[PDB]
Design an enzyme around this catalytic site. Structure first.
Site, PDB file in Angstrom:
ATOM      1  N   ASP A  42     -19.361  15.659 -16.349  1.00  0.00           N
ATOM      2  CA  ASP A  42     -20.049  14.915 -17.396  1.00  0.00           C
ATOM      3  C   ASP A  42     -20.216  13.406 -17.219  1.00  0.00           C
ATOM      4  O   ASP A  42     -20.385  12.683 -18.203  1.00  0.00           O
ATOM      5  CB  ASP A  42     -19.386  15.208 -18.749  1.00  0.00           C
ATOM      6  CG  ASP A  42     -19.690  16.609 -19.253  1.00  0.00           C
ATOM      7  OD1 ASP A  42     -19.174  17.586 -18.669  1.00  0.00           O
ATOM      8  OD2 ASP A  42     -20.460  16.736 -20.231  1.00  0.00           O
ATOM      9  N   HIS A  45     -23.619  10.766 -18.611  1.00  0.00           N
ATOM     10  CA  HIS A  45     -23.761  10.479 -20.032  1.00  0.00           C
ATOM     11  C   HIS A  45     -23.640   8.970 -20.174  1.00  0.00           C
ATOM     12  O   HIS A  45     -23.091   8.300 -19.296  1.00  0.00           O
ATOM     13  CB  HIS A  45     -22.644  11.145 -20.847  1.00  0.00           C
ATOM     14  CG  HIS A  45     -22.810  12.623 -21.015  1.00  0.00           C
ATOM     15  ND1 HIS A  45     -23.780  13.176 -21.824  1.00  0.00           N
ATOM     16  CD2 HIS A  45     -22.135  13.665 -20.474  1.00  0.00           C
ATOM     17  CE1 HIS A  45     -23.693  14.493 -21.774  1.00  0.00           C
ATOM     18  NE2 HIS A  45     -22.703  14.816 -20.963  1.00  0.00           N
ATOM     19  N   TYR A  90     -18.181  10.506 -25.119  1.00  0.00           N
ATOM     20  CA  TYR A  90     -18.280  10.505 -23.666  1.00  0.00           C
ATOM     21  C   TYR A  90     -17.555   9.385 -22.928  1.00  0.00           C
ATOM     22  O   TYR A  90     -18.109   8.791 -22.003  1.00  0.00           O
ATOM     23  CB  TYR A  90     -19.761  10.509 -23.261  1.00  0.00           C
ATOM     24  CG  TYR A  90     -20.535  11.688 -23.806  1.00  0.00           C
ATOM     25  CD1 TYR A  90     -20.165  12.996 -23.490  1.00  0.00           C
ATOM     26  CD2 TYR A  90     -21.639  11.499 -24.641  1.00  0.00           C
ATOM     27  CE1 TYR A  90     -20.873  14.083 -23.988  1.00  0.00           C
ATOM     28  CE2 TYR A  90     -22.356  12.583 -25.146  1.00  0.00           C
ATOM     29  CZ  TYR A  90     -21.967  13.870 -24.814  1.00  0.00           C
ATOM     30  OH  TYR A  90     -22.666  14.949 -25.296  1.00  0.00           O
ATOM     31  N   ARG A 162     -26.245  29.550 -29.292  1.00  0.00           N
ATOM     32  CA  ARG A 162     -26.053  28.409 -30.172  1.00  0.00           C
ATOM     33  C   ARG A 162     -27.383  27.667 -30.122  1.00  0.00           C
ATOM     34  O   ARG A 162     -27.954  27.472 -29.046  1.00  0.00           O
ATOM     35  CB  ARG A 162     -24.904  27.508 -29.701  1.00  0.00           C
ATOM     36  CG  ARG A 162     -25.034  26.930 -28.305  1.00  0.00           C
ATOM     37  CD  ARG A 162     -23.897  25.943 -28.036  1.00  0.00           C
ATOM     38  NE  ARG A 162     -23.862  25.463 -26.657  1.00  0.00           N
ATOM     39  CZ  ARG A 162     -23.494  26.202 -25.612  1.00  0.00           C
ATOM     40  NH1 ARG A 162     -23.121  27.463 -25.777  1.00  0.00           N
ATOM     41  NH2 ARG A 162     -23.510  25.679 -24.396  1.00  0.00           N
ATOM     42  N   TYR A 164     -29.504  24.261 -30.783  1.00  0.00           N
ATOM     43  CA  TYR A 164     -29.475  22.823 -30.998  1.00  0.00           C
ATOM     44  C   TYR A 164     -30.691  22.525 -31.858  1.00  0.00           C
ATOM     45  O   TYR A 164     -31.826  22.713 -31.429  1.00  0.00           O
ATOM     46  CB  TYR A 164     -29.551  22.090 -29.662  1.00  0.00           C
ATOM     47  CG  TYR A 164     -28.260  22.185 -28.893  1.00  0.00           C
ATOM     48  CD1 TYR A 164     -27.184  21.353 -29.201  1.00  0.00           C
ATOM     49  CD2 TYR A 164     -28.077  23.166 -27.917  1.00  0.00           C
ATOM     50  CE1 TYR A 164     -25.956  21.498 -28.564  1.00  0.00           C
ATOM     51  CE2 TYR A 164     -26.855  23.319 -27.273  1.00  0.00           C
ATOM     52  CZ  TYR A 164     -25.796  22.484 -27.602  1.00  0.00           C
ATOM     53  OH  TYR A 164     -24.580  22.646 -26.981  1.00  0.00           O
ATOM     54  N   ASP A 193     -26.383  23.508 -34.120  1.00  0.00           N
ATOM     55  CA  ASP A 193     -25.778  22.288 -33.598  1.00  0.00           C
ATOM     56  C   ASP A 193     -26.687  21.076 -33.788  1.00  0.00           C
ATOM     57  O   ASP A 193     -27.773  20.999 -33.195  1.00  0.00           O
ATOM     58  CB  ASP A 193     -25.480  22.499 -32.110  1.00  0.00           C
ATOM     59  CG  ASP A 193     -24.424  21.553 -31.572  1.00  0.00           C
ATOM     60  OD1 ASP A 193     -24.417  20.371 -31.961  1.00  0.00           O
ATOM     61  OD2 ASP A 193     -23.610  22.003 -30.737  1.00  0.00           O
ATOM     62  N   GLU A 221     -22.376  22.974 -36.392  1.00  0.00           N
ATOM     63  CA  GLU A 221     -21.750  22.034 -35.468  1.00  0.00           C
ATOM     64  C   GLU A 221     -22.273  20.599 -35.496  1.00  0.00           C
ATOM     65  O   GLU A 221     -23.481  20.366 -35.544  1.00  0.00           O
ATOM     66  CB  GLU A 221     -21.870  22.600 -34.048  1.00  0.00           C
ATOM     67  CG  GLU A 221     -21.326  21.717 -32.943  1.00  0.00           C
ATOM     68  CD  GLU A 221     -19.817  21.656 -32.938  1.00  0.00           C
ATOM     69  OE1 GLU A 221     -19.275  20.538 -33.056  1.00  0.00           O
ATOM     70  OE2 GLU A 221     -19.173  22.720 -32.808  1.00  0.00           O
ATOM     71  N   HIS A 246     -16.438  18.182 -32.553  1.00  0.00           N
ATOM     72  CA  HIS A 246     -15.740  17.998 -31.294  1.00  0.00           C
ATOM     73  C   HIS A 246     -14.581  17.037 -31.481  1.00  0.00           C
ATOM     74  O   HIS A 246     -14.615  16.182 -32.360  1.00  0.00           O
ATOM     75  CB  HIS A 246     -16.698  17.416 -30.255  1.00  0.00           C
ATOM     76  CG  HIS A 246     -17.858  18.309 -29.943  1.00  0.00           C
ATOM     77  ND1 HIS A 246     -17.786  19.326 -29.015  1.00  0.00           N
ATOM     78  CD2 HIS A 246     -19.103  18.368 -30.473  1.00  0.00           C
ATOM     79  CE1 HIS A 246     -18.938  19.975 -28.988  1.00  0.00           C
ATOM     80  NE2 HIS A 246     -19.752  19.413 -29.864  1.00  0.00           N
ATOM     81  N   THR A 297     -19.522  22.016 -21.869  1.00  0.00           N
ATOM     82  CA  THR A 297     -19.358  20.934 -20.918  1.00  0.00           C
ATOM     83  C   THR A 297     -20.339  21.207 -19.783  1.00  0.00           C
ATOM     84  O   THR A 297     -20.961  22.269 -19.736  1.00  0.00           O
ATOM     85  CB  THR A 297     -17.926  20.886 -20.340  1.00  0.00           C
ATOM     86  OG1 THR A 297     -17.738  21.978 -19.430  1.00  0.00           O
ATOM     87  CG2 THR A 297     -16.891  20.986 -21.459  1.00  0.00           C
TER      88      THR A 297
END
Lengths: 374, 374
Positions: A42, A45, A90, A162, A164, A193, A221, A246, A297
């Site tokens: 990651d 980001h 992040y 899921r 978004y 999400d 989410e 998160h 992730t």
């Protein structure tokens, strides 16, 4: 018994979109010769700056050199001391700590001839249900393409996804409507999400219209801006469904626990600093009588394997998780990738000491890149 | 690899007062032959009823038989399922779960040829500072006797003590005054322990008069009735010194965390159900940015050894702890007892696999009793 060296090798794996995410493959060496492997993912980001790996190796070695890999608590305190938590989703320091702590787990397990699983409290189950991502629609035109994704993935075993949402609400209902009439109960969209894109009141409006479609919906989410604890709380009281968020720092988690702001804690080792920190977060949630799910992730098989072991060791995961990093890439850097079957992520063979995932040097050289520059 | 049998042997060790506390020495056997040892102490507390050990062995075996001792999370969930938490300090189910979970730790460690320490995250230190108890004075006449205790113990290395107060406040100040003028900075009374005997306002009054004596005072322990969270909070705001309270259930701990009711969480595996549960409690406190100290128990060397390993693995213990169970008895049931030197409790030899404490069968038979009856 004593750490002697560290290797940080950057790799870039092209995604199914051509774009390349850069990861760092970690190797912690010891005086006896055993090596622990880990993954720092990651890095692609914001913030828009890159970390100097040469310098990072030096700093990390200064901390680890000569230490006993079994002193996990001591080492993690030193890691946290040098790479402080920042209440930012992040924070690169989190990815860094994650790769090191996870490699230490692999190392310790290999040394004791046991699976990382047995080093995390054993097994509660052998696999955890996960979902496949459907990235946010900006236009109602992308709907058809996403319908194919559901079609394709459902055939591959993924019956849970899921979604978004947040951008084009009309496009989201259309999609939800189309999936409902074509697959019915065959497919489930366990979560909507919002990715922290809307203030809580705007999310509430969207939630009311999208929840008209309950295709096995499990949670909502990230329905509030980052660190908007009071907003999450208000939304938690106005939303029938569980609210999930998160965990990116203990201070942030503590605020959500104290305020009883959410229902489900979405935990990923990469965003909290590793397996050790993730276990602490999961236990804090358990003590607070709250559920946990594992988050998404960009991790390859090495990092995802850590989450598989973690997830199969927890007693408070009763919902569908999101780790599908491997699905973002065609290739990887291991001999054998983690297994996904019937929409479940399986923990690596318990009879294989360590992480249960092995690196493939040829693939490592193939995807190698000089740095983590943008 | 698989649990095959369980032994629960009751023992009674006469205290320096003649009174005998009854403990249960646990032995978990496996198909390969390795055995894990544990201790169920503190049965000598209300409620005024005794548990049938024959029946208890049967129930515990039904749960454990055929299981993999490494599935600690799974087993602990089953233990909690059968022996629920009750928000009561001396719930016998907690002592029971503690003996089993601790024996499982010893078992797993022995199997892997490592110290229980390395199974708990390693070492942060090799010993933890503890204090010696001075039990509450009911009359000002007992003062002289207690002064001797301080004299005697100080010579033996204990320069820090905890004073159980609340009964006769005049007697407490006299004692504090006498110790200050005779030893000065040589001795420290790190805590004034109220044992939940006073409502918070009455404790506040006592605290104001006793704190006139600051002999290295670190905290005020249990200054409110059991589960009086709002009371602890009020006292926390009105007391300059840290407020400490025991953790006896996750629900209770969760309430104190949510309300920010205390400053220091006093944790003992026996009162929370074992090392596994104690670690969860310590981590929940860590996530909440709170300190921890290990509490007092009536445990012998077997149970106290578990706390030594636990304490030396934590990163949030910056104050003096209270485990001095062995000091209550002349004898024990082990080959070598835990080590106390210069007021520190030492973690067992890290090179000795398992708990680092071994039972002495002859001593076990010597102190054996038929049941846990009063």
């Amino acid at each position: 018994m004593k750490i002697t060296d560290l290797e940080l090798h950057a790799v870039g794996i092209p995604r199914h979109t051509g774009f390349v995410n850069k990861h760092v493959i970690v190797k912690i060496h010891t005086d006896e010769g055993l090596t622990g492997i880990g993954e720092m993912s990651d890095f692609s980001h914001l913030p828009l700056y890159s970390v100097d790996l040469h310098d990072l190796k030096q700093g990390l070695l200064s901390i680890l050199l000569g230490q006993n890999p079994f002193d996990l608590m001591k080492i993690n305190k030193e890691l946290t001391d040098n790479f402080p938590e920042t209440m930012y989703y992040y924070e690169k320091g989190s990815f860094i700590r994650n790769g090191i702590d996870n490699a230490l787990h692999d190392l310790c397990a290999k040394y004791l001839d046991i699976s990382v699983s047995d080093f995390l409290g054993g097994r509660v189950k052998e696999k955890i249900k996960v979902c496949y991502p459907i990235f946010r629609h900006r236009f109602s035109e992308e709907v058809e393409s996403n319908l194919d994704v559901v079609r394709q993935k459902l055939e591959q075993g993924f019956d849970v996804f899921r979604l978004y949402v947040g951008k084009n609400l009309d496009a989201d209902e259309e999609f939800l409507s189309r999936v409902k009439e074509e697959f019915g109960s065959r497919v489930r969209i366990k979560s909507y999400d919002f990715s922290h894109l809307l203030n809580w009141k705007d999310a509430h409006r969207a939630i009311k219209r999208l929840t008209k479609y309950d295709l096995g919906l499990e949670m909502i989410e990230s329905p509030a801006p980052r660190n908007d604890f009071d907003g999450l709380y208000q939304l938690r009281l106005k939303t029938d469904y569980p609210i999930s968020e998160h965990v990116w720092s203990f201070k942030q988690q503590q605020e959500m626990i104290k305020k009883d702001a959410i229902d489900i804690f979405n935990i990923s080792p990469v965003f909290i600093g590793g397996l050790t920190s993730a276990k602490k977060a999961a236990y804090a949630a358990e003590v607070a009588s709250k559920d946990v799910v594992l988050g998404t992730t960009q991790e390859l098989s090495v990092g995802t394997a850590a989450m598989a072991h973690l997830g199969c060791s927890l007693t408070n995961i009763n919902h569908t998780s999101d780790p599908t990093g491997p699905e973002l890439y065609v290739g990887d850097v291991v001999k054998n990738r983690v297994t996904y079957k019937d929409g479940y992520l399986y923990a690596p063979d318990r009879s294989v000491k360590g992480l249960g995932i092995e690196l493939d040097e040829s693939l490592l050289a193939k995807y190698q890149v000089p740095d983590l520059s943008w």
